[PDB]
């Protein structure tokens, strides 16, 4: 036998850990984890999930495994819990009441198809739009509605900038959509600055690399107004005033330039800091100013080896010998140039000095290198002592941080929402990129300016585009969602136009075609498809949206696994298959591997996968287009006669992609980063990408971006062909940011607390906010935090109801008093669902939508509109509110 | 009670725990989804300083005093937290007006005081303390039970409450000073951490180890001289048990936090003292903490100089199988 005395009874627990099927799962949410999981079924019921822990390790550094998090291990609760959409639902009461009638798929989809055909016929196809964000999260489900929109002419949305995740300053500097090292590379750094980044809560499966780096001898700095959870492990904590980081950064740059701790060689080669600026007009000296038929887009540096001015190679006016195709994530395809192209060679560009030069028209003008201008402005305005006054960080601290940062090799900056979600985050990121340029660590392992926010990066992006926009992105309507929301929700930003003429800039950017305005001819938006994103709940200017934008929409359709707040406020709600009931890919910027989910069981109740829903809808649209004698129509914008009677075939390439798996394989097949990989391989184990974006993807080495420019010396896709810190466009001069410098936060809200709205460990955006187990590991509802120093004089006690408000709206939420919070601000974990434990409003009630003019510039080299490449950030960290105790309910503690 | 043949041993690296509660969730989703188990967190993670779970458990009583069994209190249900419940169906699908409030009115919960800690800005301080059954070499629960329902497994030292033998006496709840047996009021039986013995029997790490996202948990048999738990507890000696003065000889150990910033003085400049007070760590782990921190800081300093440190490499755990019994399943 061989049994211990109680082993028979112990079979009771052994039975609890058993299953008869194990499938691969993923959580298709916007967390950036893309964590490999197994899902465990017994008798056709999913019991639980567990990380599969099977990403291949790299030598000498910690593995990514297990990843996972606290939401992910209860992911199955959205299969079986009280939130699930089982059947198609049609509204019967007012929007938001949660008064429904169950309908058949047929009646639901026909109502929708009827409206869609009418809207195209009676108004314009661009009065229909589909919002579905972060394609990297679930590219097949993303492609379903975007392809639908593609073939009927409906417009799409932007997400990266709308969320404020788009590193606007990085695009301004580097001319790329964005790029960042995978998190394993953090282990290669000697000195990391966590700059508005709370990875203990907001990069949970990657956070181990930081504490492991430190135990391996790295030092880490946290910069954050409050003492945040990440901060308990760092070696040094810097707590500036909210939104004053730019002054800190510029003072660091000053110390580094003054004490000469920079990499002059790197500056001379990789940046525009040697380029020459006309003293008279304060513009770049250009070829056109010197030579008949000279280019507007070529420039000069002073070569100190020959005492003569020289035209640097690689700028916008310099064409490669054979052009490449346009690349989505670059200003222009500078990969077409050969290796070595911008190598410094024997050149020695001057960084300091003044020089005279002979203009075309006979005049002689004085020119200076950008660096010379930059340097003199920093010595005058950006001393430690002056930045000390602004930030409230001591001058000694600022100086010691500068020296450490510039001395440790490699050093890196890790920035996040704390520094990216501000009105002026663009100039702040340019300053962080200035700090990286000065230290020379860009494109090195363990170095650089690395941003992390949402699940924005689908490395296989050409395969995605192949499936979503088969006739080309140039034959696809896009709005820019921040502008769309600002205008259609008729937002009041409270910025007086004599301070910043937002209206003029915005209008002028649209009428000159720099930025889009959808619908055209001022028509109202009429039909709104929302899925894979909780658009209403997360939307800035929410109160304007609900009051002004929402009632313009004749039909609002939400496709969802659960009843979120957007769906609660919708006309038709369609049931979408859970992550563990569908097939899809799942990728992120944090690691270089392809994740996926597959069905553990068939879709529950009457749910369908997103791919199938837009397939079935396409049929009913065919049927409706015929009923309405409107089967084809002209679309003069694209010179495209559209055939609504063939929509389904269009959706599926004549039936080839009628199954989810073929659509998923289609993406994998049509991208260099993935071609070779099959679904069956992914089903077994996560596979590493075959290549990446702006650097080689090397065997056994963590990805770090921009090496194609830094190492291979291809030109940067900017106007100057370098990392460009001088942006001599009229709008940048207007805002005082032709150069990186400190821009103080917007104080248009005349209220005394700065309103912070960071991301919590307890949810993934609005998803899992309402999960019972998550709420049980908090205090049962949303939370806003205050320092005791502000709460005590307001007579506010821990867990009292508090009321926070400004001109935009009001929210009433229970308070958490936390000594780590900095006085003068309050922190409300972002976007709890509207139906949760709030007596009124939510976090977005007190947020307008605001647009910085520099984000509207679209006629300046690498600055042009492309969806999710450039456009207005949806910032929100400038918001200010008042707070008082709510006295309608004051329960006693015990 | 006769020594076990091998003793399963855990090491919790407080330098690495990010308080993400994944292990709390993994454990609950495996073993405490049953009737009457909703208020039970066999594995929990609490902010230190704080009240913990159940609140004020550290003065609940129990354990041993000069080898005499102590009979402590039975924590009332409110000290554990009445698990909040919600009527989502009413508001989302049934047209009922009004917010989906938690019931009861929130007053207490297992993680109520998350990240509050102690000290005034800019020297507020806290860290995370994961806890569980300590599968003690001298289990007070086991001795307390008038029905011998609790036994320590001979093959791996895992302590288990035999659910057929249990008659709900609650002497165990009284006498465990870590307050880790939970009286199930539906079944009239105590329930507690089972050391994931079915996983351990198949050579799979307990879920609170295998699923530890911060990569802070180690597990193994302490007799295995090549295990990270042997290395941290016996060789380098940087892993201590929680409240040794309770006299139960826990077999779960903690590496105390040495990561962390300095006390900030009124002029804005660093002290040499850490924000985490030594006195706090001494309260949890006793007078050996000082020397452990000294070793840890010393070894990290070698790493900063670019020198070798085997100890640091162990904590870093570049491969999970160097920390634990295989986590694959
Ligand atoms: N004041 C302030 N405002 C801010 C922010 C702030 O920091 N402060 N942060 C931002 C940021 S940075 C972001 S990235 C947004 O919160 C992201 O919201 P999102 O709607 O995409 O996620 P969310 O999780 O909420 O919604 C995802 C929806 O999709 C459902 N879902 C998830 N998976 C699927 C699926 O496979 N198919 C379908 N059809 N649906 C699915 C999900 O239930 C939820 O409704 C935004 N505003
Ligand atoms: N568990 C979980 N993780 C997530 C998400 C989630 O919803 N849940 N969302 C993901 C996504 S899409 C986002 S965009 C990211 C956001 O996550 P993060 O990038 O970390 O940004 P935040 O949470 O907004 O704030 C990070 C820290 O910066 C601080 N900080 C706030 N204001 C300032 C400032 O003015 N200056 C400085 N130096 N610091 C400031 C905040 O108080 C906060 O402590 O998280 C991603 N990770
Ligand atoms: S939710 Fe996001 S982070 Fe948490 S486990 Fe699933 S994928 Fe990983
Ligand atoms: S999972 Fe690991 S890291 Fe997260 S809380 Fe539990 S122990 Fe700490
Ligand atoms: S911790 Fe409490 S329950 Fe677990 S063994 Fe030690 S005494 Fe018994
Ligand atoms: S060992 Fe197993 S049972 Fe005990 S706490 Fe960890 S997961 Fe829960
Ligand atoms: S004392 Fe014994 S009888 Fe049950 S309640 Fe505790 S195991
Ligand atoms: O799926 S269970 O944990 O209710
Ligand atoms: O204030 S009470 O409800 O903790
Ligand atoms: Mo985001
Ligand atoms: Na739930
Ligand atoms: Zn569950």
From TrEMBL, chain A:
Coiled coil start-end: none
A GO CC term assigned to this protein in UniProt: membrane
Segments passing through the bilayer: none
InterPro entries: Asp_de-COase-like_dom_sf, DMSO_Rdtase_II_Mopterin_su, MopB_CT_Nitrate-R-NarG-like, MoPterin_dinucl-bd_dom, Mopterin_OxRdtase, Mopterin_OxRdtase_4Fe-4S_dom, Prok_molybdopt-oxidoreductase, TAT_signal
Residues at which [4Fe-4S] cluster binds: 27, 31, 35, 69
Superkingdom of the source species: Bacteria
Cofactor list: Mo-bis(molybdopterin guanine dinucleotide); [4Fe-4S] cluster
GO biological process: cellular respiration
Family statement drawn from the similarity comment of this UniProt entry: Belongs to the prokaryotic molybdopterin-containing oxidoreductase family.
Name of protein: DMSO reductase family type II enzyme, molybdopterin subunit
UniProtKB/TrEMBL annotation, chain B:
Binding residues for [4Fe-4S] cluster 2: 17, 23
Keywords of this entry: 3Fe-4S, 4Fe-4S, Electron transport, Iron, Iron-sulfur, Metal-binding, Repeat, Transport, Zinc
Record carries keyword Iron-sulfur: yes
Binding site for [4Fe-4S] cluster 1: 17, 20, 23, 212
Ligand binding ([4Fe-4S] cluster 3): 27, 193
UniProt-annotated binding residues for [3Fe-4S] cluster 2: 147, 167, 169-172
Subcellular location: Cell envelope
Name of the molecule in the record: DMSO reductase family type II enzyme, iron-sulfur subunit
Binding site for [4Fe-4S] cluster 5: 133, 136, 141, 176
Binding positions for [4Fe-4S] cluster 4 per the UniProt entry: 27, 193, 196, 208
Chain residue ranges for the region called Disordered: 97-117
Recorded GO CC terms: cell envelope; membrane; periplasmic space
MF (Gene Ontology): 3 iron, 4 sulfur cluster binding; 4 iron, 4 sulfur cluster binding; electron transfer activity; metal ion binding
InterPro entries per record: 4Fe4S_Fe-S-bd (IPR017896), DMSO_Rdtase_II_Fe-S_su (IPR017839)
Cofactor: [3Fe-4S] cluster; [4Fe-4S] cluster
Membrane-spanning ranges: none
Pfam families in the cross-refs: Fer4_11
Biological process terms in GO annotation: anaerobic respiration
Residues binding Zn(2+): 29
PROSITE patterns to which the protein is assigned, alphabetical: 4FE4S_FER_2 (PS51379)
Domain 4Fe-4S ferredoxin-type: 8-36, 124-155, 157-186
Binding of [3Fe-4S] cluster 1, residues: 145, 147, 166-172
């Amino acid at each position: 036998s061989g049994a211990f005395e109680y082993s028979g009874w112990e079979n009771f627990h052994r039975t609890q850990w058993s299953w008869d099927k194990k499938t691969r799962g993923a959580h298709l949410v916007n967390c950036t984890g893309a964590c490999p999981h197994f899902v465990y079924s017994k008798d056709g019921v999913v019991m639980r999930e567990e990380q599969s822990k099977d990403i291949a390790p790299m030598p000498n550094i910690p593995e990514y495994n297990p990843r996972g998090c606290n939401k992910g291990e209860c992911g199955h609760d959205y299969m079986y819990g009280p939130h699930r959409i089982k059947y198609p639902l049609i509204r019967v009461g007012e929007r938001g009441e949660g008064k429904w009638r169950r309908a058949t798929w047929e009646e639901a989809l026909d109502m929708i198809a009827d409206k869609c055909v009418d809207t195209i016929k009676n108004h314009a196809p661009d009065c229909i739009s589909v919002y579905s964000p972060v394609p990297a999260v679930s590219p097949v489900s993303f492609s379903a509605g975007h392809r639908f929109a593609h073939y009927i002419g409906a417009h799409a949305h932007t997400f990266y900038d709308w969320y404020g995740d788009h590193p606007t300053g990085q695009t301004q500097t580097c001319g790329v959509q964005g790029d960042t090292c995978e998190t394993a590379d953090w282990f290669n750094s000697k000195y990391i600055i966590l700059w508005g980044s709370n990875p203990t809560q907001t990069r949970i499966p990657d956070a181990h690399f930081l504490s492991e780096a430190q135990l391996n001898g790295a030092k880490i700095v946290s910069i954050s107004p409050d003492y945040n959870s990440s901060t308990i492990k760092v070696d040094k904590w810097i707590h500036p005033q909210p939104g004053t980081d730019g002054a800190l950064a510029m003072a660091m740059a000053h110390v580094i330039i003054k004490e000469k701790l920079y990499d002059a060689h790197s500056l001379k080669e990789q940046t525009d800091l040697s380029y020459l600026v006309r003293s008279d007009t304060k513009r770049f000296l250009r070829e056109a100013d010197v030579v008949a038929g000279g280019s507007k887009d070529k420039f000069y540096f002073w070569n100190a080896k020959t005492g003569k001015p020289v035209i640097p190679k690689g700028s916008w006016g310099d064409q490669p010998e054979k052009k490449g195709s346009p690349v989505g994530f670059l200003g222009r395809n500078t990969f077409a140039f050969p290796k070595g192209y911008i190598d410094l060679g024997d050149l020695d560009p001057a960084l300091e000095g003044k020089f005279n030069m002979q203009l075309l028209d006979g005049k002689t003008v004085e020119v200076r290198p950008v660096f010379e201008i930059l340097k003199s402005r920093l010595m005058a305005d950006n001393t430690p002592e002056k930045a000390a006054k602004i930030t409230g960080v001591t001058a000694k601290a600022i100086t010691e941080l500068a020296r450490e940062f510039a001395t440790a090799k490699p050093s890196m900056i890790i920035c996040g929402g704390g520094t990216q979600h501000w009105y002026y985050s663009d100039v702040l990121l340019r300053a962080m990129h200035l700090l990286t340029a000065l230290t020379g660590t860009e494109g090195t392992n363990g170095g650089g300016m690395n941003h992390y926010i949402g699940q924005w990066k689908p490395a296989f992006v050409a395969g995605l585009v192949a499936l979503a926009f088969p006739e080309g992105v140039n034959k696809q309507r896009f709005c820019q969602t921040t502008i769309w929301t600002y205008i259609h929700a008729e937002v009041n930003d409270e910025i007086i136009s004599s301070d910043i003429d937002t209206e003029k800039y915005l209008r002028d950017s649209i009428t000159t075609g720099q930025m889009p305005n959808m619908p055209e001819q001022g028509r109202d938006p009429k039909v709104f498809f929302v899925y894979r994103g909780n658009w209403l709940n997360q939307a800035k200017g929410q109160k304007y949206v609900l009051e002004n934008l929402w009632p313009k929409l004749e039909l609002i359709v939400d496709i969802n696994i659960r009843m979120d707040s957007t769906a609660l406020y919708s006309d038709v709600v369609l049931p979408s298959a859970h992550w563990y009931e569908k097939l899809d890919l799942n990728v992120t910027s944090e690691h270089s591997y392809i994740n996926m989910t597959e069905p553990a069981i068939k879709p529950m109740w009457e749910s369908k996968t997103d791919w199938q829903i837009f397939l079935a809808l396409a049929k009913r649209v065919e049927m409706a287009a015929k009923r309405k004698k409107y089967e084809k129509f002209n679309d003069e914008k694209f010179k495209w006669v559209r055939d609504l009677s063939n929509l389904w075939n269009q959706m599926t390439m004549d039936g080839k992609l009628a199954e989810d798996e073929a659509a998923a394989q289609y993406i994998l097949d049509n991208a260099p980063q993935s071609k070779g990989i099959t679904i069956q391989m992914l089903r077994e184990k996560p596979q590493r990408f075959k290549s990446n974006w702006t650097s080689p993807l090397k065997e056994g080495v963590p990805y770090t971006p921009f090496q194609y420019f830094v190492v291979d010396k291809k030109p940067w896709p900017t106007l100057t062909g370098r990392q460009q810190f001088y942006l001599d466009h009229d709008t940048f001069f207007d805002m005082g940011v032709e150069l990186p410098t400190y821009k103080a936060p917007i104080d248009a809200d005349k209220y005394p607390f700065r309103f912070n709205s960071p991301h919590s460990r307890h949810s993934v955006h609005s998803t899992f906010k309402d999960n019972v187990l998550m709420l049980r590991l908090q205090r049962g509802g949303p939370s806003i935090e205050m320092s005791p120093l502000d709460a005590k004089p307001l007579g506010i006690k821990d867990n009292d109801w508090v009321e926070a408000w400004n001109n935009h709206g009001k929210v009433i939420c229970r308070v958490k008093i936390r000594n780590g919070e900095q006085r003068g601000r309050v922190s409300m974990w972002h976007c709890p669902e509207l139906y949760m434990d709030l007596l009124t409003g939510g976090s977005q009630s007190v947020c307008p939508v605001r647009i910085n003019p520099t984000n509207l510039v679209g006629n300046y080299g690498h600055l042009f509109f492309r969806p999710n490449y450039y456009g207005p950030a949806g910032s929100q960290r400038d918001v200010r509110v008042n707070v008082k105790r709510y006295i309608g309910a004051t329960p006693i503690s015990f | 009670m006769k020594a076990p043949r091998r003793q399963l041993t855990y090491v919790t690296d407080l330098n690495k725990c990010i308080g993400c509660q994944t292990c709390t969730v993994a454990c609950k989703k495996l073993w405490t989804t049953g009737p009457g188990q909703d208020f039970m967190y066999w594995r929990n993670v609490e902010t230190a300083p704080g009240l913990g779970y159940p609140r004020n458990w550290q003065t609940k009583g129990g354990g041993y005093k000069n080898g005499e069994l102590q009979k402590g209190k039975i924590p009332p249900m409110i000290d554990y937290g009445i698990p909040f419940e919600f009527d989502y169906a009413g508001r989302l699908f049934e047209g009922k007006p009004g917010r989906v409030r938690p019931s009861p009115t929130p007053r207490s919960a297992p993680n109520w005081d998350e990240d509050q800690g102690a000290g005034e800005y800019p020297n507020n301080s806290f860290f995370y303390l994961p806890r569980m059954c300590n599968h003690c070499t001298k289990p007070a629960c086991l001795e307390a039970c008038p029905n011998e329902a609790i036994y320590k497994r001979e093959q791996d030292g895992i302590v288990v409450i035999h659910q057929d033998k249990c008659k709900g006496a609650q002497a165990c709840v009284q006498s465990c000073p870590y307050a880790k047996p939970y009286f199930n009021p539906l079944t009239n039986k105590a329930n507690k951490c089972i050391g994931c013995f079915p996983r351990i029997e198949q050579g799979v790490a307990p879920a609170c180890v295998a699923q530890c996202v911060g990569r802070a948990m180690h597990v193994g048999f302490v007799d295995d001289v090549n295990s990270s738990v042997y290395k941290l507890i016996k060789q380098y000696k940087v892993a201590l048990p929680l409240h040794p003065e309770f006299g139960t000889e826990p077999n779960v150990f903690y590496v105390p936090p040495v990561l962390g910033p300095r006390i900030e003085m009124a002029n804005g400049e660093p002290s040499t003292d850490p924000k985490i007070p030594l006195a706090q760590l001494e309260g949890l782990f006793g007078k050996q903490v000082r020397d452990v921190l000294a070793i840890l800081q010393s070894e990290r300093e070698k790493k900063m100089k670019g020198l070798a440190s085997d100890l640091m490499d162990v904590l870093i755990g570049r491969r999970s199988t160097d920390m634990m019994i295989s986590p694959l399943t």
